[PDB]
RNA sequence: AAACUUUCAACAACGGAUCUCUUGGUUCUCGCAUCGAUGAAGAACGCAGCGAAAUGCGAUACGUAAUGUGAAUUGCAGAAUUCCGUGAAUCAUCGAAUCUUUGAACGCACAUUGCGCCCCUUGGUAUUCCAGGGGGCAUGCCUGUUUGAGCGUCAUU
């Protein structure tokens, strides 16, 4: 085993960066596996950390400058680092997706939930209630259900996506009181984990077992409740 | 007289002169530019069925692959080869290989076959550790690259 304070040495990267990567692999301190390290730092990931520092080194400088035009162009031409070689490793078969999908949902379907904050974006707000109006569209459709259970701290569910009874709160629709000890910086990259998790698995849902992905939506529905009669579905 | 000493002759000995030879040398002329951190020149340890030097070669070790030739190698022993063919040969050619320990010698060292570090790792559950396989870690300097440091300078309603 190696020290925490060994491994950011080592990886020369972010601490947070460090606690950013360590939940996308998946990685516990027992302390710290040192061939898991030693396995992490060959990873794609961790080129895009080095190269989102020196982007945001690049930048600074420009707008330091006033050149914006020059600081416009680089946003541009920036790439976005994805998460799906992260998910393989992780997520050898589909069926030991879903046995994890358990709390992806029940962090997704908190964050429809709630005000856009400074600390919060609203995009990855906007998308999370998109993403649950897109479970419950296939859930919905081929009636998916099993249980339920409406209690005190919000409403769960359960349903066999191929036979593992999901469960998954659903908060109640109110004003949430933020409070001021969370840490919307280890939530949101679970969510950021969990949002392109849940990408693949609704792509795997409609486009072998049922429709297209994602299917359009009907804004003028949405217009009236913003929920589930809306985002209207097709097979093809 | 014999023996002995000396002289000559004959036949043996001793020695290697002379003659003849010559895969060697020397000199002259002509042409060409071709060593080394991809590790040379040099030193050492080894390697063949049986070897001293020489020559060749590096645990793939008097060789391996490739191409040509077309049937030997031969001091001795012993294997071979379908010989109307992917093929004998210490053959020729030579472009692909391996290339021990060193040596400008380059992980740290002094004259220690010691003293280690990192990466990759197949095995002994290997989470502990143990062993094997493989590649690197010298100095100076250039072009970068990068994490920085610097009351070194300036900006800042």
């Not at 030693?38 to 006033?66: C, D, I, N």
């Not at 469960?167 to 280890?186: G, Q, T």
Request: aromatic share 14%; with cysteine; proline share 4%.
């Amino acid at each position: 085993f190696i020290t925490r304070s060994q491994a950011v040495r080592k990886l020369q990267v972010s601490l947070a960066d460090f606690r950013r990567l360590c939940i996308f692999k998946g990685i516990y301190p027992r302390f710290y596996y040192a061939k898991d390290i030693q396995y992490l730092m060959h990873e794609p990931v961790l080129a895009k950390f080095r190269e989102h520092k020196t982007f945001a080194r690049k930048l600074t400088r420009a707008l330091g400058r006033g050149e914006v035009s020059s600081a416009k162009r680089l946003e541009e031409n920036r790439d976005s680092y994805t998460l799906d070689h992260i998910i393989k490793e992780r997520y050898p078969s589909f069926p030991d997706a879903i046995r994890d999908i358990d709390d992806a949902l029940n962090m997704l379907f908190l964050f429809s939930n709630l005000p856009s904050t400074n600390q919060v974006s609203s995009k990855i707000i906007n998308d999370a209630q998109k993403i649950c109006n897109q479970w419950l569209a296939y859930v919905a459709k081929e009636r998916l259900v099993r249980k339920v259970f409406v209690s005190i701290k919000g409403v769960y569910y359960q349903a066999n996506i191929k036979g593992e009874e999901v469960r998954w709160l659903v908060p109640f629709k109110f004003p949430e009181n933020i409070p001021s000890d969370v840490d919307f910086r280890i939530m949101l990259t679970f969510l950021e984990f969990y949002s392109t998790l849940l990408h693949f698995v609704l792509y795997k849902l409609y486009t072998d077992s049922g429709l297209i992905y994602p299917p359009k939506l009907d804004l003028k529905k949405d217009k009236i409740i913003s929920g589930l009669s809306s985002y209207i579905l097709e097979s093809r």
